[PDB]
Amino acid sequence: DMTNMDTRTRHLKVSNCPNNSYALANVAAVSPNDFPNNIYIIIDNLFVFTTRHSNDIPPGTIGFNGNQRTWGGWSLNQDVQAKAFDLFKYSGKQSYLGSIDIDISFRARGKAVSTVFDQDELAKQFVRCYESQIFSPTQYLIMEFQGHFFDLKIRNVQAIDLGDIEPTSAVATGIETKGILTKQTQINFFK
């Protein structure tokens, strides 16, 4: 609910993630004082993340996991400017994901297995873990499936509005396109 909320820019220092649960939630761990819970915030007008309360992160600092920091190209103890991100006002109408392609890789190359995994299970668990979140192409994330840790890199995102029976928007690879994950998004998994 972005109808009423401040949009002032805050300078927060990037720190280590408190624990693996927040990293597996694909959320920026912020203090309750820093930002309310479950609200979208954009850093550098580029990287969108969902705030999650954490007691291990002091005020004035923002928590990220390894993959998100690598995507952001940030060093430990570096300032970043975060603002409240209104997807509805930003994209206007293309606030939903029509198609999303994800490249899946073994986080541990030595733990590769030859079993055949079904992409539908991956879609189900990915949605379960990251439902109702803003995603943009070229985003690195960590997901645990069947006890195996995988690195997921979003390849491309197609943004559509709620009501387009026929997808008319071209599959975009730029970070600009953004949409909230929904059960109806057409999820494709590639190597």
Binding site: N16, N20, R69, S75, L76, R107, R109, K111, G147, F149
Partner: protein, 146 residues
Amino acid sequence: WYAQDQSVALSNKCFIKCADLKALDGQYIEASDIYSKLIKSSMGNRLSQWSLKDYFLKKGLCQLAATDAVAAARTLQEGQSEDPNFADSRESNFLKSLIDAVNEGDSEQLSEHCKEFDNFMRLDKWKITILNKIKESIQQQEDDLL
């Protein structure tokens, strides 16, 4: 106090000892900070070049013992761009290889790089300890993988 007397070399020796002990004592961030101070004090002096060449390496190693691979990469880039001698030095290549190995989480690759580095330039007990804690940190990450 030596710095307060403008004795750069004596302060540099004392700071080397302090940083060495601090890194061996689990205080990697402080050791890296002291190494940065040593780098800044020794920059531009023709007598201390090699010291710089090692300093950068050591600093990066400490930053890698703290699991701060990005900072190690920043230190490597700063050393390469600021000191031409360090850019072409074997220490720079070794630090880059260690950074890449930690990024890919390949402990065996790190061990191979360490052996290659030892084959041409003998390692010292300080480096042994730093890289051992780093490898044990990779093992701890493997524990977190489960």
